[model samples]
Target chain A: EVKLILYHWTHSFSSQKVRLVIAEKALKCEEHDVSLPLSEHNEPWFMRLNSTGEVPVLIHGENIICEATQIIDYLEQTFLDERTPRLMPDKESMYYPRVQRYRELLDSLPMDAYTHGCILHPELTVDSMIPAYATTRIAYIAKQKRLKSKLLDHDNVKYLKKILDELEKVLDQVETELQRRNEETPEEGQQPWLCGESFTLADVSLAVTLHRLKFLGFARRNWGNGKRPNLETYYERVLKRKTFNKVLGHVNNILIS
Target chain B: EVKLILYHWTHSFSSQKVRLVIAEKALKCEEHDVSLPLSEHNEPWFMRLNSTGEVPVLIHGENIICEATQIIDYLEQTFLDERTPRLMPDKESMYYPRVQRYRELLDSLPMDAYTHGCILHPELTVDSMIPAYATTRIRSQILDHDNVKYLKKILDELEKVLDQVETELQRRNEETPEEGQQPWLCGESFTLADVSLAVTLHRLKFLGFARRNWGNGKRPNLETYYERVLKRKTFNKVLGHVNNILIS
Candidate 1:
């Protein structure tokens, strides 16, 4: 019996988020590659493991963990890898709150940049976790049902413009955060990694969301505008990590498969 | 200066989630009510503190914490009061995973009951907290965005969710610790898992979905489990108002 197994997809950002943790931590996991577009995650057996039917479900012994964020957190808690830096900063550390603030910020985004871009207006977006549906069909239908127009069709130019406005507001905040961190290192010559230099779990998700955005063609719209050099530099740092490099190479191949 | 100030709503389930931890821990916090319905949270100053602009936001000295779930976790980590039982279970315990499973189930629910309650009257900004994980998506779906068309469909989904939780409860209690068991969910001690579930159930009760809506005797596991939870005295005490609020 493979005591530890991970059900994940290549292009799915959430799945990659878990992969980053596993790779960085140097933890060995039996991989069960479930394709998102193929809707293999909707199968009854997988659904039995995770009733909500989200991808990147981890089976540790008999325990089935769903929710990408929770799976990542649990991986950090349960798997102690000496080779990896502690992804979670100490509870007492000063940068922890900032990391949390950033986590919630990511959680707020819809990743529908292809549709309307990020909406910054508090009323337009919910800073809530996306729930998993029993089937991909149900999930797809539910998401489509929410929109005023078709899911991927961007013919609604006005919606596009409005979402872009909101999108810029969010990226601007990202720039502002990085710039502030650049200025606020009270310790002499210390450069904080998003939530300080210790490489907390916050960096895991933060780095991946951007990696996906760039993968999805929002790189220019997001960190590429030259106004936010700090974000660009920091993003480079996240991109260079061993785990990210390892996972980035596989994204393209998995899609064509 | 007060070391801690909690920005919360009286009826907010997320607010209650934090309140349960504080009461259980016996921690003192200055109360600051930010009316969600009044759209006071949308103001520039509040927005700066929490871009998400929801509550209960906790300020512990210099650290600004948003999301009720994080606040509760932080409270447990920082406030080491022996008077209260430890809300977090030890990681090594077998029941820890059960606790996590219970948490995500609650955190995953859609807030249609609260969202649709005042469709005819749109003043109150309802729903609360990140129970299992973060409230990133559903907050976008039900709380922040408006959708009358999906309201009926959402209600139908809620029934499925209700069924899912009932099934979880039945399965979970099967592994229940013998009374006086050192740790069941964290070995018999009530952990944050219970706190998370209680707030969720309480919110469900408040939402007019009605307690045991999915079951009366059909699922006795949850009924007895909820009975144990309500008996834990903080159920009423945390919500006790100051009676001294200025009526002006």
Candidate 2:
């Protein structure tokens, strides 16, 4: 029973991921905000702990795990038994490697790049329902010239097309996997998760990923309107999970408070 | 014995990483050349196994591990015993999480962007000794728009990472009491962090940036570490024949 402390930003997509894993396991830990878009992550003290300047750093006793994937790995390995539900399947289980594959696919995605890239192309920012905080954050990113100097520095039209094309390929694979997984029937009264009957780390990866896509205003054109029904349905399933609700609510509450 | 099959490209930086791990462990695995820039990875069959279309895909019986990091994890998990050298340290060791941090730091670097971006910024491409194959590959990547657009930012990111590496190596070198023992990135053992750094250094060298970035007494610790890593039998076995045109 070692103490666990998590330094996270409510608005950061990576932070929401670690939060979901923590909530799912019902792990008691102290949480602190290092609001990323506000540049608090750039503070010297925090950088000393994690030189990478990324949020969602976890300190479990002597081990300080930075990077959300590494943090999630630490959690999955440490918390398993009757007390905590297993988010990672056993290595012997067939689902283990599949879960790893799915996690890597999502991890390799450039969500931050896409989120900031959208600001440069206002036509894609058609959704008026984007949260006020996200809008402000997007404005901050735009002013920082992070995405603009990269995308708009060249042929804006072609760069946007390339980004969308790559995003679609990865998204399409998600739809295909879901379609295949759905072919198998779940246990009594339970829906099929990403890895057959059990929810896994892959599900956690996709949960925050889809949430960010929705937050950044891509849900409608990408998955909504029956574009990718499996993905749309999967996001809906993820939404109903109590852990997901608690984590998202926590972030929203902190933002307003 | 589960037969491990690797689909890799000789020129791919990621592919080299997987090869180094395999060689270090002396694990027997079937290997095939995918030649990524040649568009073989884009073929429907290859894409079926890995949707991302990235090279260095490892198949162990039924499990298809695509990313280099995932493949490395799979290997480290499955192969550890009395026989294989442990690339990933035991969780209890302080080096365990530190190795993970180092891996992520390197993984987050936009190397592909910097490589292609260097092609555009010829002034930074000071070396005339870049491998012909790498030069051709750079041109091919230049044909794509994904990386060149972010040259400036990519360089900034690369510089930060290099500085971090320099600092870590300097600290480790000073702290270790042994006189002649080479300090790997994480700890005394040749862990995955060094494997990552070796491949990265090779890539940087192959691209002819060693002199400008770390060679010639600039970042002396990294330079010395690179020299030590370059002489390793495992590194030489996989990448020895590949001409490091500039660093020679």
Candidate 3:
């Protein structure tokens, strides 16, 4: 009997990404709500489990896997069943390198910093994406910094500004890659996912990030307004997916409340 | 025909990491020095290859792999043959999960943040460890005050990781052959875990924190482990020399 336990936060980007993989595979996991709002992740007991103090930690039988992407990889490796949808492609396949490249690209983003940085600089971000509870969010951020004895607000604007610039460039590259994938595919009827004909780990990685970006109100600025048509279509396609909706929609409901 | 090209910085932690694997495998690669000091990594052409603007990007034939750990994985996969040593074990082996766990633990460290934070917080580090040229070398107004707060937290995190490394080394020491065996981070044979740790430990030493952080009999297991790592032929080949970079 394989004991599958996942310690995750409801609103964490990393948590959502890993959960999408779980939802895709339809694996039953004993999930623990390591609340970010409550800072339960910073607890002594949890810290022992993961020194990084970050989540989507997956404990499968004897193995303790932290780091969200690593957990995703572990799940793919451990759950080698005919029933499950294989997210990661075979290592020998051409899609394997492609998937790995996209994984590295999407996974390496400074999402937390980018998210909070946007909040810190209200002037730089879009109006619709700014949640109504801006004050609460701002206070929480300040409290986090204060508690950590870190920067208050000033430095983040500059830091976030740089990150914002880099993210746009990254998104542009994503758009370009998607465009190439579209051209390479012969069939107009086939909506090619990143890496190939199959929806893959790359798509899973991008979907949650796109959702987060949209949640922060960057969707219109980023993919909308016909700037990056391929990404626009890709996001729309991901938005309609069962796994994305089931996992992200659950988180979206909380944010709406 | 396959071409293995690596875009790396001479002194970057991530670059050295991937390079260590290259040396270990004895793979010939076309190496490009993307100088961090000159801001070559931030250039448009390079950014087109890797948006993150970090080094240790590998170009194997048509495929472009960025991120140090990812490249290491790419290498392990692509160079699968009897001639080259396998850095990763078979998926079914018990060592596979253990190797993956250590890789994640070591790879996930915010090494850049921790390094800059240490430089920012002079009081928290040993004077001998802090190079004289740190002010000019780092040269960031944002990094100065922006990272001071993270110093304590990063220090605490590093302490925990170091403790974990020490514990692992101690366990391996007991299980190892008393007479002639050399125990690695993940048991005997050096895996990606060793590569991750060797690079991390080397970075610590380069930053001059190894002495105050893990040396002086504080973490004897880790101390001994670093000595063993340093003695590795592959590691030495990958990391050739260290010098005082701090300007007077």
Best by TM-score: 3
* Model 3, span A1-257: residue lDDT tens: 65687766666678788888999998898886544332333322211212223445565543445667778988998897898889888899877897888888988888877565555555666744554455244498888878665554556666877777788888888988998988997865787887788778888888888877775656666777778999988988888888788778756443342
For every candidate, what is the interface RMSD in angstroms? Answer: 16.7, 16.4, 16.0
Off by over 4 Å in 1: A36-54, A80-84, A112-160, A184-191, A252-256, B1-248
Per residue, candidate 1 scores C-alpha lDDT tens digits across A138-176 of: 378777676745543345455655655675777788778
Per-residue alpha-carbon lDDT of candidate 1 for residues B1-248, written as tens digits (9 for 90 to 100): 43676666555566777877887777778875544322333322111112322445566643445667777777877776567567765567666676777666666665434433323222332332212112333344434334554554555666575566567655545666544432223235666776776666665553334432534565455556666666667766764331112211
Worst 10 residues of 1 chain A by lDDT: A115-124
TM-score of each: 0.40, 0.45, 0.46
lDDT against true structure, model 1: 0.57
How many times do residue backbones clash in model 2?
A: 0
Error of 2 at A75 (Å): 1.1
Instruction: Indicate whether candidate 1 or candidate 3 has the larger TM-score.
Output: 3
Candidate that beats the other on lDDT, 1 or 2, i.e. the better one: 2
**Candidate 2 residues A118-137, lDDT tens each?**
55454665462334344333
Top of the candidates by lDDT: 3
Q: Where does candidate 2 clash, by residue pair?
A: none
Quality of candidate 1 docking, DockQ: 0.02
**Cα deviation of B77, candidate 1, in Å:** 46
For model 3, fnat equals 0.00
